[PDB]
Amino acid sequence: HHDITFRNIRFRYKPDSPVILDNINLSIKQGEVIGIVGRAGSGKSTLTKLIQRFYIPENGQVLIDGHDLALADPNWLRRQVGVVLQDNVLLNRSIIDNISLANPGMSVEKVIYAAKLAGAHDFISELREGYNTIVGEQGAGLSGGQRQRIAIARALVNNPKILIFDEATSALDYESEHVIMRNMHKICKGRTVIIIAHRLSTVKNADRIIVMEKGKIVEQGKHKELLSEPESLYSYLYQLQSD
Ligand SMILES: Nc1ncnc2c1ncn2[C@@H]1O[C@H](COP(=O)(O)OP(=O)(O)O)[C@H]2O[C@@]3(O[C@H]21)C([N+](=O)[O-])=CC([N+](=O)[O-])=CC3[N+](=O)[O-]
Fold first, then answer.
1. Which atom, in ligand 1's list, is nearest to the CA of 47?
2. Within its chain, how far is the Cα of 175 from the centroid?
3. Where do the annotations place ATP binding?
4. Domain range spanning residue 161?
5. Is the beta carbon of 43 within 6 A of some atom in ligand 1?
6. Burial class (CB in 10 A: 0-12, 13-18, 19+), 152
7. Is 215 in the pocket of ligand 1 (CB under 6 A)?
8. What distance in angstroms lies between residue 131's CA and the mean position of ligand 1's atoms?
9. Are 50 and 9 in contact (CB under 8 A)?
10. Can you tell me which atom of ligand 1 is nearest the CA of 49?
């Protein structure tokens, strides 16, 4: 079963603006972990925006489960998809408020469970105020990698069947990243996962990596097969990022 299908997707942001996605054809099986790589501006983020129907393609179809999103309940779609955002944890609100923000009227139990998968529960439990800790620096003063784990928990809180990791902007501390990587298989368990990867190394063990260039998927496959393809863009980007 495919959880995410793109068929002949053409997309531009404004009626006269440039074509950002040209003839995107993609089918992601249920429970697959997909890495998406490519130069800045290749259209990786744009792709995930269409998954959430933040925008509507001029040509082609985006389907979840087989449900064309043109016809799908927008309320249903919001619940299917969890997004791990970057640098979007409200400082003026509590950790629990930041985790349950997408649906404010849930349960402490669901929140904790999400924080546990996120690898955030342990450090939250050791704060004076616990989950009621105001993220802002006049309460305790959390770090970037901590806030990132909260962001993961927020994405996870409603048990989305599809999880999207927005490209990492900032660089995270060792403990956070080690915790995140250690927990990834648990974070991803039972979910169709998309990771937009800054460093190619991040998605090396993805089931499949999608290589985008100038709004096209140019290459796709496992790390090994992508490197085996002579003159592949993938191999070039790997080389550029190698020590
Ligand atoms: N809300 C929005 N409204 C309009 N366009 C949006 C947009 N969000 C993204 N874009 C543009 O679409 C293209 C794809 O961006 P994106 O999907 O974010 O790529 P990555 O995720 O691969 O980094 C980008 O190309 C560029 O701007 C971006 C881009 N860039 O990403 O540096 C640079 C230039 N430029 O220097 O003229 C032009 C671009 N463009 O789409 O015309």
1. 17
2. 20
3. 38-45
4. 1-243
5. yes
6. buried
7. no
8. 37
9. yes
10. 17
